[PDB]
Structure 1
Amino acid sequence: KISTSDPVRQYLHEIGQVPLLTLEEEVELARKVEEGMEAIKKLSEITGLDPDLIREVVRAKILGSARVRHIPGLKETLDPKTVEEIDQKLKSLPKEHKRYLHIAREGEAARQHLIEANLRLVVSIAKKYTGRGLSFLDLIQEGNQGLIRAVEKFEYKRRFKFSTYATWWIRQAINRAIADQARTIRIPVHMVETINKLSRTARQLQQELGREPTYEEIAEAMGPGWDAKRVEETLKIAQEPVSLETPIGDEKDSFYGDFIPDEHLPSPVDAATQSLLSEELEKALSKLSEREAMVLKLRKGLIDGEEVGAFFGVTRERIRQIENKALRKLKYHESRTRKLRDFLD
């Protein structure tokens, strides 16, 4: 039964049950997030294990077993053996070093209780950026992709509040997704900030003139390197692919697509020309001294058409030689037996 509410609800359910203290607890978790990486960074030292390892293995010990490591990203690492093994070394580390394992673990745990206490902090924000071209959910989803990305970076020591800090990164993440997923034909961020201007300028001109601006009014208005061919060209692209499937004519049954022809496929009269062309050129291929014919033959023919590095051994002057001569003899033995004359093309 209709999504949206469930999530909006599921959030408030653990949000409405797990809100965070405006300072304290947030500052608490924070210290436990930073002392986390810092910790792990030392584990890697005392263990010659890549940070990427510790970070993962510590996460599973908390988030999920060997289950979440299998289906997500294939068995590169031993769901069973490899993971416990690593942990074995961590727990085997003397008090002085194991200290950090517990801190690491206690570290990632805090991250957990800092990302949730704001899932609504995202929703609110998302509430604004909406009708651009993404479900409310996605808009919220891409907002959370930003919430976390904002935790990895917050420095609690620099007294300024978290909530805020999150705002920035969140909007950052939503926009990207917007610019990057919004359409069917990928357009760059560049030619995006630029289309909006044009959409806008289109209105400023709608404002006073009355005549829907010619690609001149718009061009002058926009800026420098803006011609008339430019704006006209900018829009066809700023368009929206029309559904290959849409009611046409006295719309009833007749579906659009059936009005669009084909081209790759040669229609019977052409499939018959390659027939005649092939054989006839191939019959007029034999009445030749293969020593040079078969070089231009396959040249345009087989691979691709460069006269220089053309022939195997012999130099150039013998290329054109038999070329220009064979070609011509080839041209007049056909003038007689008129086969290609009436251009098969």
Structure 2
Amino acid sequence: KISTSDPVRQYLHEIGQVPLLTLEEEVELARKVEEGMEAIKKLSEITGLDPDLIREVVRAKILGSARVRHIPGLKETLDPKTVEEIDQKLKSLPKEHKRYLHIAREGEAARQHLIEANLRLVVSIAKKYTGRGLSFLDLIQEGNQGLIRAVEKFEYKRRFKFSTYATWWIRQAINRAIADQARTIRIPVHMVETINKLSRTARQLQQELGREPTYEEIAEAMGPGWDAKRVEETLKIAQEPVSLETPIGDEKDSFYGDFIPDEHLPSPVDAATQSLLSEELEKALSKLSEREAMVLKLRKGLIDGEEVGAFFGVTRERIRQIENKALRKLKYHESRTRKLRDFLD
């Protein structure tokens, strides 16, 4: 049954059952989140265990069983024995550090609750970044991703409530995505705003001339280093890629694709060519002094394109010697029995 509604209902349901109290509830979870951190750290300190490891084990025992560790991130950690052993030393921590364990867990849980209650916040925001080029579901999701990011750096010690805080973090994550995925071809953010700028400029330029401004106007209006070559180049990138599969001519079964020709593939004639060229050239390669004939033949046609560095040990004078005397003796007896003359190219 058509997505959208169901998930809207889905969290609007859990929000509708649990919104966060303006202060109390928000501040509450927050304080539990930070202490969880302070805890995990101090834990890492007493156990010499990695905070990332402290954080994942507590997460398991609270969020899910071996199911969530195994299928998501492959079984690097022993689904049972590993995480268990870890939880063990947590128990062994006497009355002092044990306390933190209980803190870490509860904090982590607190975290979740904070996240859930503020999903409508994402929806309201994301609801305005609609017609950018992303699915509304995609827009909220990313925005959500931003909310979590917000939950990473919020300092409740600093009175201002989460509301305004998440706003930014979300919007950031949103725009990022918008510029990142909304195209069949990735383009840096700089070039994005640039195109906007150009676009915006064209609008003002579409305001009085009654002439869709020549690349001269746009170059001028935009500013500093803008030129015709520039504008022409930008707009050419702006344009979205059309469908290789599209109705053609008198809208019928004709599909755009069959219309585009090939270039790699050597259409039969070239195949024919390569045959003679190879066969004949090979017949001429065998009638030659190897030394400086193979050097240039291999340096030119076998690796890349260095007179001195072309011959093994014999210096440049013996190179230029056989290179220009064999190649000329080669070119002229071939002038006799004309086999290559007729430029195969």
Task: Flag whether TM exceeds 0.5 (same fold).
Answer: yes
Cα deviation for residue 304 of structure 1 reads 1.7
Q: Secondary structure at the match of 1:62?
A: helix
Which whole-Å CA distance do the structure 2 matches of 1:324 and 1:21 have between them? 91
Q: TM-score, normalised by structure 2?
A: 0.99
Per-residue CA shift, 1:224-257, capped at 9, x if unaligned?
0001111111100011101111011111111001
| TM-superposition CA deviations, 1:141-185 (whole Å, max 9, x none) | 001100010011100011011111110100000000000001011
169-178 vs 282-291, which moves further: 282-291
Report if aligned partners of 1:197, 1:222 keep a CA contact under 8 Å in 2: yes
CA distance in 2, matches of 1:97, 1:61: 18
Deviation at 1:301, TM superposition (A): 2.1
Q: Which deviates more from structure 2 when the two are superposed, residues 71-80 or residues 249-258? A: 71-80
Q: Deviations over 1:45-93 (max 9, x none)?
A: 1011111101111101111111111121111111122111111111111
| Superposition deviation, residue 102 in structure 1 | 0.3
CA distance in 2, matches of 1:274, 1:306: 28
| Alignment-derived partner of residue 288 in structure 1 | 288
1:172-215 alpha-carbon deviations (Å, 9 max, x no partner): 00000000001011100010111101111110011111100000
Which runs of no fewer than 5 residues in structure 2 stay unpaired? Answer: none
Q: Please list the CA deviations of residues 95-140 of structure 1 after superposition, one character each: whole Å capped at 9, or x if unmatched.
A: 1111100000011010011000001110011110111001110000
Q: Check conservation: 1:276, 1:344, Cα contact below 8 A.
A: no
1:254-291 Cα deviation digits (max 9, x unpaired): 10011100101111111111111111111111111112
Identify the range of structure 1 (118-127 vs 294-303) with the bigger mean alpha-carbon deviation: 294-303
Identical aligned residues as a percent: 100
Write the distance in 2 (CA, Å) between the matches of 1:156 and 1:87. 29
Kept in 2, the 8 Å contact 1:143–1:170? The answer is yes
After TM superposition, where is structure 1 displaced by more than 6 Å over at least 4 residues in a row?
none
* Structure 1 SS opposite 2:183: coil
RMSD: 0.8
3-state SS, counterpart of residue 96 of structure 2: helix
Aligned partners of 1:335 and 1:46: how far apart in 2?
88
Q: Give the secondary-structure state (helix, strand or coil) at the position aligned to 2:131.
A: coil
Give 1:308 shift. 2.3
Please give the TM-score of this superposition, normalised by the length of structure 1: 0.99
Three-state SS of the structure 2 residue aligned to 1:179 is helix
- How far apart in 1 are the matches of 2:316 and 2:55? 66
Aligned partner of 1:178 in structure 2 is 178
